[PDB]
Amino acid sequence: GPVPSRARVYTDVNTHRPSEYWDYESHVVEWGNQDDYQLVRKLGRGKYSEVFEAINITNNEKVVVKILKPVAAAKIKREIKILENLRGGPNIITLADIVKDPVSRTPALVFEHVNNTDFKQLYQTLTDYDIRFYMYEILKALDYCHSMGIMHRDVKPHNVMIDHEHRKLRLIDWGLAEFYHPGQEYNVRVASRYFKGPELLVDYQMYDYSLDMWSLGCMLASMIFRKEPFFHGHDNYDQLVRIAKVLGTEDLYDYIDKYNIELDPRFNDILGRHSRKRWERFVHSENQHLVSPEALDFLDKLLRYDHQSRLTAREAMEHPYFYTVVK
Numbered sequence: 001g002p003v004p005s006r007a008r009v010y011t012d013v014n015t016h017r018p019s020e021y022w023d024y025e026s027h028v029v030e031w032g033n034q035d036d037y038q039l040v041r042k043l044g045r046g047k048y049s050e051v052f053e054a055i056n057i058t059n060n061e062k063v064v065v066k067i068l069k070p071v072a073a074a075k076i077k078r079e080i081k082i083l084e085n086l087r088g089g090p091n092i093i094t095l096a097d098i099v100k101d102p103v104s105r106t107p108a109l110v111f112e113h114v115n116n117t118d119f120k121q122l123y124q125t126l127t128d129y130d131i132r133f134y135m136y137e138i139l140k141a142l143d144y145c146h147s148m149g150i151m152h153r154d155v156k157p158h159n160v161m162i163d164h165e166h167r168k169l170r171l172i173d174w175g176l177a178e179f180y181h182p183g184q185e186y187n188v189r190v191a192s193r194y195f196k197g198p199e200l201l202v203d204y205q206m207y208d209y210s211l212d213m214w215s216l217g218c219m220l221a222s223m224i225f226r227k228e229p230f231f232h233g234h235d236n237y238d239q240l241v242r243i244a245k246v247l248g249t250e251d252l253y254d255y256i257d258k259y260n261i262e263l264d265p266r267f268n269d270i271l272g273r274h275s276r277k278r279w280e281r282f283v284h285s286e287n288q289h290l291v292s293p294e295a296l297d298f299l300d301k302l303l304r305y306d307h308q309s310r311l312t313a314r315e316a317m318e319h320p321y322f323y324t325v326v327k
Protein backbone atom coordinates (compact mmCIF):
# COMPACT_ATOMS: atom_id res chain seq x y z
CA GLY A 1 0.00 0.00 0.00
CA PRO A 2 0.92 3.67 0.37
CA VAL A 3 4.24 4.39 2.12
CA PRO A 4 3.95 6.40 5.37
CA SER A 5 4.94 10.03 5.79
CA ARG A 6 5.87 12.21 8.78
CA ALA A 7 6.21 15.96 9.15
CA ARG A 8 9.82 17.07 9.16
CA VAL A 9 9.16 19.80 11.75
CA TYR A 10 7.09 19.81 14.94
CA THR A 11 6.75 16.08 14.41
CA ASP A 12 6.09 14.92 17.98
CA VAL A 13 4.79 18.08 19.66
CA ASN A 14 1.44 16.54 20.58
CA THR A 15 2.94 13.22 21.70
CA HIS A 16 4.81 15.01 24.51
CA ARG A 17 1.80 17.04 25.65
CA PRO A 18 -0.57 16.05 28.43
CA SER A 19 -3.57 14.45 26.76
CA GLU A 20 -5.75 17.39 27.82
CA TYR A 21 -4.02 19.57 25.19
CA TRP A 22 -5.12 17.48 22.20
CA ASP A 23 -7.90 15.26 23.63
CA TYR A 24 -10.59 17.77 22.72
CA GLU A 25 -13.38 15.27 23.46
CA SER A 26 -12.52 15.41 27.15
CA HIS A 27 -12.45 19.23 27.21
CA VAL A 28 -14.96 20.85 29.57
CA VAL A 29 -16.19 24.17 28.19
CA GLU A 30 -16.41 27.14 30.56
CA TRP A 31 -19.51 29.05 29.49
CA GLY A 32 -19.93 32.81 29.44
CA ASN A 33 -23.15 34.80 29.68
CA GLN A 34 -25.12 35.02 26.44
CA ASP A 35 -26.75 38.26 27.61
CA ASP A 36 -23.39 40.08 27.37
CA TYR A 37 -23.76 39.95 23.57
CA GLN A 38 -26.53 41.58 21.55
CA LEU A 39 -26.70 40.44 17.93
CA VAL A 40 -26.40 43.31 15.46
CA ARG A 41 -26.41 41.89 11.94
CA LYS A 42 -26.30 38.60 10.10
CA LEU A 43 -22.98 38.44 8.24
CA GLY A 44 -23.38 35.08 6.53
CA ARG A 45 -23.70 31.34 6.87
CA GLY A 46 -21.05 28.66 7.09
CA LYS A 47 -21.54 25.03 6.22
CA TYR A 48 -22.01 24.28 9.94
CA SER A 49 -22.69 27.73 11.40
CA GLU A 50 -24.30 31.15 11.08
CA VAL A 51 -22.26 34.29 11.73
CA PHE A 52 -23.48 37.58 13.21
CA GLU A 53 -22.05 40.98 13.99
CA ALA A 54 -22.79 41.76 17.63
CA ILE A 55 -22.00 44.19 20.44
CA ASN A 56 -20.48 43.17 23.77
CA ILE A 57 -22.69 45.35 25.97
CA THR A 58 -20.26 45.07 28.91
CA ASN A 59 -17.64 47.14 27.06
CA ASN A 60 -19.61 48.27 23.96
CA GLU A 61 -16.96 46.70 21.72
CA LYS A 62 -17.86 45.06 18.42
CA VAL A 63 -17.65 41.26 18.30
CA VAL A 64 -18.67 38.46 15.95
CA VAL A 65 -20.83 35.52 17.05
CA LYS A 66 -20.57 32.17 15.24
CA ILE A 67 -23.57 30.03 16.18
CA LEU A 68 -22.78 26.41 15.46
CA LYS A 69 -25.28 24.02 13.92
CA PRO A 70 -26.21 20.72 15.62
CA VAL A 71 -25.10 18.86 12.46
CA ALA A 72 -21.51 19.11 13.62
CA ALA A 73 -21.15 15.45 14.69
CA ALA A 74 -18.81 16.24 17.61
CA LYS A 75 -16.65 18.72 15.67
CA ILE A 76 -17.55 21.69 17.88
CA LYS A 77 -15.25 20.47 20.65
CA ARG A 78 -12.25 20.32 18.31
CA GLU A 79 -12.64 23.90 17.05
CA ILE A 80 -13.14 25.21 20.59
CA LYS A 81 -10.08 23.41 21.93
CA ILE A 82 -7.91 24.52 19.00
CA LEU A 83 -9.05 28.13 19.40
CA GLU A 84 -8.24 28.06 23.12
CA ASN A 85 -4.85 26.40 22.53
CA LEU A 86 -3.88 29.07 19.98
CA ARG A 87 -5.35 32.11 21.73
CA GLY A 88 -2.86 34.97 21.87
CA GLY A 89 -0.72 33.66 19.01
CA PRO A 90 0.41 36.10 16.31
CA ASN A 91 -2.38 36.88 13.87
CA ILE A 92 -4.66 34.13 15.27
CA ILE A 93 -8.28 35.23 15.69
CA THR A 94 -9.05 35.65 19.38
CA LEU A 95 -11.89 33.61 20.86
CA ALA A 96 -13.31 36.07 23.39
CA ASP A 97 -16.06 33.86 24.82
CA ILE A 98 -18.22 30.78 24.40
CA VAL A 99 -21.93 31.04 25.21
CA LYS A 100 -24.95 28.81 24.75
CA ASP A 101 -27.23 30.41 22.18
CA PRO A 102 -30.76 30.81 23.57
CA VAL A 103 -32.50 30.10 20.25
CA SER A 104 -30.47 27.33 18.61
CA ARG A 105 -29.20 25.83 21.86
CA THR A 106 -25.86 25.10 20.47
CA PRO A 107 -22.51 26.66 21.38
CA ALA A 108 -21.88 30.13 20.00
CA LEU A 109 -18.28 31.25 19.62
CA VAL A 110 -17.58 34.94 20.26
CA PHE A 111 -14.61 36.41 18.38
CA GLU A 112 -12.92 39.78 18.31
CA HIS A 113 -14.25 41.89 15.47
CA VAL A 114 -11.97 42.65 12.50
CA ASN A 115 -12.80 45.71 10.36
CA ASN A 116 -11.80 43.83 7.23
CA THR A 117 -12.49 43.99 3.58
CA ASP A 118 -12.04 40.17 3.73
CA PHE A 119 -8.72 39.68 1.77
CA LYS A 120 -10.33 38.13 -1.29
CA GLN A 121 -11.79 41.60 -1.94
CA LEU A 122 -8.35 43.17 -1.40
CA TYR A 123 -5.65 40.70 -2.43
CA GLN A 124 -6.05 41.51 -6.13
CA THR A 125 -5.36 45.25 -5.55
CA LEU A 126 -2.20 45.14 -3.42
CA THR A 127 1.18 46.55 -4.29
CA ASP A 128 4.26 44.33 -4.45
CA TYR A 129 5.29 45.54 -1.00
CA ASP A 130 1.88 44.81 0.49
CA ILE A 131 1.77 41.27 -0.93
CA ARG A 132 5.10 40.58 0.78
CA PHE A 133 4.00 42.32 3.97
CA TYR A 134 0.74 40.40 4.34
CA MET A 135 2.27 37.08 3.26
CA TYR A 136 4.78 37.48 6.09
CA GLU A 137 1.91 38.16 8.51
CA ILE A 138 0.08 35.01 7.36
CA LEU A 139 3.29 33.02 7.84
CA LYS A 140 3.50 34.17 11.47
CA ALA A 141 0.08 32.61 12.06
CA LEU A 142 0.90 29.38 10.24
CA ASP A 143 4.23 28.85 11.96
CA TYR A 144 2.54 29.48 15.28
CA CYS A 145 -0.25 26.97 14.77
CA HIS A 146 2.12 24.37 13.27
CA SER A 147 4.53 24.80 16.20
CA MET A 148 1.53 24.20 18.45
CA GLY A 149 0.77 20.93 16.70
CA ILE A 150 -2.18 22.14 14.63
CA MET A 151 -2.82 22.25 10.89
CA HIS A 152 -5.42 24.73 9.68
CA ARG A 153 -6.52 22.73 6.58
CA ASP A 154 -8.61 25.56 5.11
CA VAL A 155 -6.14 28.27 4.14
CA LYS A 156 -7.78 30.50 1.52
CA PRO A 157 -8.41 34.22 0.97
CA HIS A 158 -11.84 34.16 2.64
CA ASN A 159 -10.27 32.86 5.85
CA VAL A 160 -7.78 35.72 6.18
CA MET A 161 -9.37 38.87 7.59
CA ILE A 162 -7.45 42.03 6.68
CA ASP A 163 -8.01 45.45 8.19
CA HIS A 164 -6.15 47.23 5.40
CA GLU A 165 -6.56 50.65 6.99
CA HIS A 166 -4.71 49.47 10.11
CA ARG A 167 -2.58 46.86 8.29
CA LYS A 168 -3.70 44.04 10.58
CA LEU A 169 -4.49 40.45 9.62
CA ARG A 170 -6.19 37.50 11.34
CA LEU A 171 -6.44 33.86 10.30
CA ILE A 172 -10.01 32.68 10.95
CA ASP A 173 -12.33 29.65 10.64
CA TRP A 174 -10.57 26.92 12.56
CA GLY A 175 -13.52 24.55 12.04
CA LEU A 176 -11.50 22.23 9.76
CA ALA A 177 -8.28 22.48 11.79
CA GLU A 178 -6.84 19.33 13.35
CA PHE A 179 -4.11 18.15 15.69
CA TYR A 180 -1.13 16.61 13.90
CA HIS A 181 -0.24 13.14 15.21
CA PRO A 182 2.62 11.36 13.44
CA GLY A 183 1.36 8.38 11.46
CA GLN A 184 -2.30 9.39 11.62
CA GLU A 185 -4.41 9.08 8.48
CA TYR A 186 -6.65 12.10 7.95
CA ASN A 187 -9.75 12.84 5.93
CA VAL A 188 -8.78 14.27 2.53
CA ARG A 189 -12.15 16.10 2.21
CA VAL A 190 -10.67 19.32 3.62
CA ALA A 191 -9.72 22.72 2.18
CA SER A 192 -11.53 24.45 -0.68
CA ARG A 193 -11.11 23.07 -4.22
CA TYR A 194 -8.73 25.69 -5.61
CA PHE A 195 -6.46 25.41 -2.53
CA LYS A 196 -6.39 21.63 -2.16
CA GLY A 197 -2.91 20.13 -2.15
CA PRO A 198 -1.97 17.29 -4.49
CA GLU A 199 -1.97 14.94 -1.49
CA LEU A 200 -5.71 15.50 -1.08
CA LEU A 201 -6.44 15.20 -4.81
CA VAL A 202 -4.59 11.86 -5.09
CA ASP A 203 -6.17 10.56 -1.86
CA TYR A 204 -3.02 10.35 0.27
CA GLN A 205 -4.19 10.49 3.89
CA MET A 206 -0.94 10.75 5.90
CA TYR A 207 -0.47 14.48 5.30
CA ASP A 208 0.73 17.20 7.66
CA TYR A 209 1.24 20.96 8.20
CA SER A 210 2.73 21.17 4.70
CA LEU A 211 -0.81 21.06 3.27
CA ASP A 212 -1.24 24.64 4.52
CA MET A 213 1.93 25.67 2.68
CA TRP A 214 0.52 24.44 -0.63
CA SER A 215 -2.66 26.46 -0.02
CA LEU A 216 -0.53 29.49 0.83
CA GLY A 217 1.38 29.01 -2.42
CA CYS A 218 -1.90 29.00 -4.34
CA MET A 219 -2.78 32.33 -2.71
CA LEU A 220 0.64 33.79 -3.56
CA ALA A 221 0.37 32.71 -7.19
CA SER A 222 -3.07 34.33 -7.46
CA MET A 223 -1.70 37.59 -6.05
CA ILE A 224 1.54 37.96 -7.99
CA PHE A 225 0.03 36.83 -11.30
CA ARG A 226 -3.39 38.50 -10.86
CA LYS A 227 -5.11 35.20 -11.68
CA GLU A 228 -8.09 34.18 -9.59
CA PRO A 229 -7.85 31.39 -8.89
CA PHE A 230 -4.45 30.27 -10.08
CA PHE A 231 -5.41 26.58 -10.51
CA HIS A 232 -8.95 26.79 -11.89
CA GLY A 233 -10.30 23.25 -11.69
CA HIS A 234 -13.87 22.48 -12.66
CA ASP A 235 -14.01 19.69 -10.03
CA ASN A 236 -11.56 17.80 -7.81
CA TYR A 237 -10.36 15.70 -10.76
CA ASP A 238 -9.82 18.62 -13.12
CA GLN A 239 -8.10 20.44 -10.27
CA LEU A 240 -5.18 18.02 -10.45
CA VAL A 241 -5.12 18.38 -14.24
CA ARG A 242 -4.86 22.17 -13.87
CA ILE A 243 -1.91 21.70 -11.52
CA ALA A 244 -0.27 19.23 -13.88
CA LYS A 245 -0.51 21.73 -16.76
CA VAL A 246 1.80 24.00 -14.72
CA LEU A 247 4.04 21.63 -12.75
CA GLY A 248 4.20 18.83 -15.32
CA THR A 249 3.12 15.19 -15.15
CA GLU A 250 6.48 13.42 -14.76
CA ASP A 251 7.01 15.00 -11.26
CA LEU A 252 3.43 14.04 -10.41
CA TYR A 253 4.10 10.45 -11.39
CA ASP A 254 7.35 10.54 -9.38
CA TYR A 255 5.41 11.78 -6.34
CA ILE A 256 2.86 8.97 -6.77
CA ASP A 257 5.69 6.47 -7.17
CA LYS A 258 7.59 7.69 -4.10
CA TYR A 259 4.61 7.42 -1.76
CA ASN A 260 3.36 4.22 -3.44
CA ILE A 261 0.00 5.86 -4.17
CA GLU A 262 -2.66 4.10 -6.26
CA LEU A 263 -3.77 6.88 -8.60
CA ASP A 264 -7.53 6.88 -9.25
CA PRO A 265 -7.90 5.29 -12.72
CA ARG A 266 -10.15 8.16 -13.68
CA PHE A 267 -7.02 10.31 -14.08
CA ASN A 268 -5.74 8.04 -16.88
CA ASP A 269 -8.18 9.59 -19.35
CA ILE A 270 -7.76 13.25 -18.31
CA LEU A 271 -4.20 13.90 -17.05
CA GLY A 272 -2.40 13.71 -20.38
CA ARG A 273 1.31 14.47 -20.60
CA HIS A 274 2.60 17.91 -19.62
CA SER A 275 5.99 19.45 -19.01
CA ARG A 276 6.58 22.03 -16.29
CA LYS A 277 6.13 25.59 -17.49
CA ARG A 278 8.70 28.11 -16.40
CA TRP A 279 7.14 30.70 -14.12
CA GLU A 280 7.89 33.50 -16.58
CA ARG A 281 5.11 32.07 -18.79
CA PHE A 282 2.55 33.61 -16.40
CA VAL A 283 4.07 37.11 -16.37
CA HIS A 284 2.35 39.77 -18.46
CA SER A 285 2.12 43.54 -18.66
CA GLU A 286 -0.59 43.75 -15.99
CA ASN A 287 1.22 41.68 -13.32
CA GLN A 288 4.91 42.23 -14.06
CA HIS A 289 5.28 44.88 -11.33
CA LEU A 290 4.34 42.18 -8.76
CA VAL A 291 6.87 39.65 -10.04
CA SER A 292 10.55 39.55 -9.10
CA PRO A 293 13.13 36.74 -9.21
CA GLU A 294 12.66 36.40 -5.45
CA ALA A 295 8.87 36.06 -5.77
CA LEU A 296 9.19 33.34 -8.41
CA ASP A 297 11.81 31.39 -6.48
CA PHE A 298 9.67 31.56 -3.34
CA LEU A 299 6.52 30.42 -5.16
CA ASP A 300 8.50 27.65 -6.86
CA LYS A 301 9.49 26.31 -3.43
CA LEU A 302 5.90 26.29 -2.10
CA LEU A 303 4.13 24.75 -5.10
CA ARG A 304 5.73 21.30 -5.10
CA TYR A 305 3.90 18.01 -5.44
CA ASP A 306 6.01 16.37 -2.72
CA HIS A 307 4.64 17.72 0.55
CA GLN A 308 7.95 16.88 2.25
CA SER A 309 9.84 19.16 -0.15
CA ARG A 310 7.80 22.36 0.29
CA LEU A 311 9.13 25.16 2.45
CA THR A 312 7.94 25.05 6.02
CA ALA A 313 6.48 28.24 7.43
CA ARG A 314 9.79 29.09 9.13
CA GLU A 315 11.81 28.29 6.01
CA ALA A 316 9.44 30.52 4.06
CA MET A 317 10.01 33.41 6.47
CA GLU A 318 13.75 33.12 5.80
CA HIS A 319 13.29 33.55 2.07
CA PRO A 320 14.91 36.55 0.26
CA TYR A 321 11.41 37.67 -0.93
CA PHE A 322 10.91 39.01 2.63
CA TYR A 323 14.26 40.88 2.88
CA THR A 324 12.44 44.00 1.51
CA VAL A 325 9.80 43.89 4.30
CA VAL A 326 10.61 45.91 7.42
CA LYS A 327 10.97 43.71 10.49
Ligand SMILES: O=C1NC(=O)/C(=C/c2ccc3ncccc3c2)S1
Pocket (backbone or CB within 6 Å): 043, 046, 049, 051, 064, 066, 093, 111, 112, 113, 114, 115, 116, 161, 172, 173, 174
Ligand atom coordinates in the same frame (compact mmCIF):
# COMPACT_ATOMS: atom_id res chain seq x y z
O1 LIG B 1 -17.01 31.06 9.98
C1 LIG B 1 -16.26 31.74 10.67
N1 LIG B 1 -15.27 31.25 11.47
C2 LIG B 1 -14.51 32.15 12.16
O2 LIG B 1 -13.58 31.86 12.91
C3 LIG B 1 -14.95 33.53 11.87
C4 LIG B 1 -14.32 34.58 12.43
C5 LIG B 1 -14.51 36.03 12.30
C6 LIG B 1 -13.79 36.89 13.13
C7 LIG B 1 -13.90 38.24 13.02
C8 LIG B 1 -14.75 38.82 12.06
N2 LIG B 1 -14.83 40.19 11.97
C9 LIG B 1 -15.65 40.70 11.06
C10 LIG B 1 -16.43 39.94 10.20
C11 LIG B 1 -16.36 38.58 10.27
C12 LIG B 1 -15.50 37.98 11.21
C13 LIG B 1 -15.36 36.58 11.35
S1 LIG B 1 -16.29 33.51 10.77
Ligand code: NA
Pocket (backbone or CB within 6 Å): 322, 323, 324, 325, 326, 327
Ligand atom coordinates in the same frame (compact mmCIF):
# COMPACT_ATOMS: atom_id res chain seq x y z
NA1 NA C 1 11.97 41.18 6.41
